[PDB]
């Protein structure tokens, strides 16, 4: 199997987890707990990684860091990246916008004054969600009728964002719909129920939101 590693959090790794599970690809993941930082600092430079970082992916053929590069590699092996330069670019665009969606949630959650700036993120949030809703249109998924790694990225961002704004998707039922379609996919549903599934934390433990040891309610 492929070997992966990350913190025992959702973060940037969830979408790759989801992708692998969807494709039924075999993997084992080394999970670094909250108090394993020092442990990583000594694996970091000894796995043969060109640009050491978390997450990583290691198999017989390839050694990789950068979560989207990892997803893209897995997808590339299954011919999922696009058949033309314009198809591939379009997927690269959705991918980058998806990262923006996730990272916008990172930069609000890692504010030292979180409880006094969440008011503004949430104000610009509907505009951002409207853009995604419009882009989806009547398609089942972001790139057409087949699932793409990009769908797992957006899915994860949406499932995270709703912990802050639980009702954010009420105005965007095509995004809600999209969200459930992903959750209801047989391999994804089975996985979301499994022992291996990580539901918390969203971000690293130290974040003002999306961290800690338990979800808020």
* Residues sharing a CB contact under 8 Å with residue 186, sequence separation 6 or more, in sequence order: none
Choose between 21 and 95: whose C-beta lies nearer to its own copies: 95
Which of 62/190 has CB closer to its own copies?
Answer: 62
- Where along the sequence are the contacts to its own copies (CB under 8 A)? 50-53, 61-62, 64-70, 72-73, 76-77, 85-86, 88-90, 92-97, 100, 131, 135
Q: What angle do CA 174, 172, 133 make, to 5 degrees?
A: 65
Candidates 48, 79, 119, 186; binder of Cl ion (CB under 5 A) is 186
**185 is a contact residue toward Cl ion (CB under 5 A):** yes
Strands (E), 9-167: 27-32, 56-58, 63-65
Of its own copies, Cl ion, none, which one does residue 186 interact with (CB within 5 to 8 Å by kind)? Cl ion
- Of 112 and 216, the one with the shorter C-beta distance to its own copies is 112
Residue 58: Cβ-neighbour burial (10 angstroms; 0-12, 13-18, 19+)? middle
Q: Beta strand 2-7 with 27-32: parallel, antiparallel or unpaired? A: parallel
**Least distance CB 177 / Cl ion (angstroms):** 17
Q: How far is the CB of 190 from Cl ion (least distance, A)?
A: 8
**Which is nearer to Cl ion, 93 or 190 (by Cβ)?**
190
When CB distances are held under 5 to 8 angstroms depending on the partner's kind, the choice from its own copies, Cl ion, none that residue 187 binds is: Cl ion
Burial (CB count <10 Å: 0-12, 13-18, 19+), residue 3: middle
């Amino acid at each position: 199997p492929a070997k992966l590693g990350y913190w025992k959090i959702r973060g940037l790794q969830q979408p790759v987890r989801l992708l692998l599970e969807y494709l039924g690809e075999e993997y084992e993941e080394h999970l670094y707990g909250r108090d394993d930082r020092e442990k990583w600092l000594g694996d970091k430079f000894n796995m043969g990684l060109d640009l050491p970082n978390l997450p990583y992916y290691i198999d017989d053929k390839c050694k990789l860091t950068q979560s989207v590069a990892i997803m893209r590699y897995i997808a590339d092996k299954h011919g999922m990246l696009g058949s033309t330069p314009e198809e591939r670019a379009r997927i690269s665009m959705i991918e980058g916008a998806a990262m923006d969606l996730r990272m916008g949630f990172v930069r609000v959650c890692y504010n030292p004054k979180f409880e006094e700036v969440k008011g503004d993120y949430l104000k610009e949030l509907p505009t951002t969600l409207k853009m995604w809703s419009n882009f989806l249109g009547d398609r089942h998924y972001l790139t057409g009728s087949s699932v793409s790694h990009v769908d797992f990225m957006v899915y994860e961002a949406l499932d995270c964002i709703r912990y802050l704004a639980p009702q954010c998707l009420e105005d965007f039922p095509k995004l809600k719909e999209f969200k459930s379609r992903i959750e209801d996919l047989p391999k994804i549903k089975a996985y979301m129920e499994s022992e291996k599934f990580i539901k918390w934390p969203l971000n690293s433990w130290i974040a003002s939101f999306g961290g800690g040891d338990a979800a808020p309610a």
